[PDB]
Structure 1
Amino acid sequence: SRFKVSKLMAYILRHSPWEFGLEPDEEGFVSIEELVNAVRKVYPWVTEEYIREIVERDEKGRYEIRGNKIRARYGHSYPVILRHEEDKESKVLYHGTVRRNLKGIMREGIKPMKRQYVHLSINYEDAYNTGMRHGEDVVVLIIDAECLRNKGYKILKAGKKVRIVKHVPVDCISGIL
């Protein structure tokens, strides 16, 4: 299924490419031809044409292809430089988290966990679903993205829904849902 193969693509591209003999460049890209060979170790019926269709059809825009190179657009657990197109349009974004985090966030703003980027969403629904990852008592923070930009921070379009930024200062949080 596309779900099973996409789930494995995400794992390879975000988390364990070396396990499959792949060497991502500094931007997270691997050869799509070698990715087929890697995926075929689990699902031998996969074709390059199939992986390309998965990228084209993916609901979240999880993947990016340029020529012979493919990457996950977000979510990597190893260091990547992601020079995505800037979101200069969004006025308000959302960040899902757990209530226990409010104290630190109110003191220090939203910081990225493993350096790199803080994840934001354009939808309140996606942000809540995201916060459920870290526990039951989820709150969604409203982010004034205009304020963020004016403080000098670039918000980048990492997927159809996901937005990434280096840090969110406390002053840029306009509400809690």
Structure 2
Amino acid sequence: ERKRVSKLMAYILRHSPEEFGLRPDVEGFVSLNELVNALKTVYPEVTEEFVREIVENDPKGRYEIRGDRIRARYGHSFPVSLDHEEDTESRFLYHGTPRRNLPSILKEGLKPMKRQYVHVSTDKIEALETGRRHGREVVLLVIDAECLRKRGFKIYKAGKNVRIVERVPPDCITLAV
């Protein structure tokens, strides 16, 4: 049950709020009341406290609540002004992706594709888990963070391990494993 409701929250808060009549503010926030009513049109047993539990217990830091407002921290496919802190300490960042994507990435770099930002991780396991969601022969990409910073692509702390960046030029991918 928790996972079904969390997935629908991610759909609403990252991709299609307007399908439920919700309009996020410039920071990606909608009211908690609004989200709850939206979720109840699919899962009528949902309550504000159950959503608060989802948020507190999320293992990746998917969600954030500011008072009576909630957003997804990352993953959006529509414009958001996020106020996350910069990751200045990480030396290496990781991105897992099916091997079938590697020729294109070696030419183009990582691109945000359908989302606003490229997502990477400080954590090798989480990067690989993400890649494996997409397909079978996952490669772990090792990314030189300081390369990114040098080229004006600042990295931001979007979740526990999740990091967001505008793009990752192929020169900043040091290894594919």
The TM-score, its normalising length taken from structure 2, stands at 0.90
Give the alignment of 1:1-177 within 5 angstroms.
1-114=1-114, 116-177=116-177
Q: CA deviation at 1:163?
A: 0.7
CA contact 2:148–2:168 (8 Å) conserved in 1: yes
Q: 1:129-153 CA distances to partner (integer Å, 9 max, x unpaired)?
A: 2222332222111011122222221
Q: CA deviation at 1:62?
A: 0.4
Aligned residue for 2:9, secondary structure, equals: helix
Instruction: Give the whole-Å Cα distance in 2 for the aligned partners of 1:167 and 1:16.
Output: 23
Aligned residue for 2:85, secondary structure, equals: coil
CA contact 2:155–2:163 (8 Å) conserved in 1: yes
The TM-score, its normalising length taken from structure 1, stands at 0.90
Q: CA deviation at 1:73?
A: 1.0
Q: CA deviation at 1:115?
A: 6.0
Aligned amino acid, residue 23 of structure 2: E
Instruction: Give the whole-Å Cα distance in 2 for the aligned partners of 1:160 and 1:75.
Output: 14
Q: 1:38-61 CA distances to partner (integer Å, 9 max, x unpaired)?
A: 112222232222212221111111
Aligned residue for 1:40, secondary structure, equals: helix
Question: Can you give the 5+ residue segments of structure 2 that lack an aligned partner in the other structure?
Answer: none
What is the count of residue pairs matched by the alignment? 177
CA contact 2:78–2:115 (8 Å) conserved in 1: no
Aligned amino acid, residue 118 of structure 2: V
Instruction: Give the whole-Å Cα distance in 1 for the aligned partners of 2:32 and 2:24.
Output: 11
Instruction: Give the whole-Å Cα distance in 1 for the aligned partners of 2:129 and 2:143.
Output: 17
Aligned amino acid, residue 7 of structure 1: K
Q: CA deviation at 1:118?
A: 0.8
Percentage of matched positions with identical amino acids: 69
CA distance 1:160–1:20, shift in 2 (3 Å): same
CA contact 2:96–2:130 (8 Å) conserved in 1: yes
Aligned amino acid, residue 93 of structure 1: L
Q: CA deviation at 1:157?
A: 1.1
Instruction: Give the whole-Å Cα distance in 2 for the aligned partners of 1:7 and 1:104.
Output: 29
Q: CA deviation at 1:161?
A: 1.9
Higher mean C-alpha displacement, 150-159 vs 40-49: 40-49
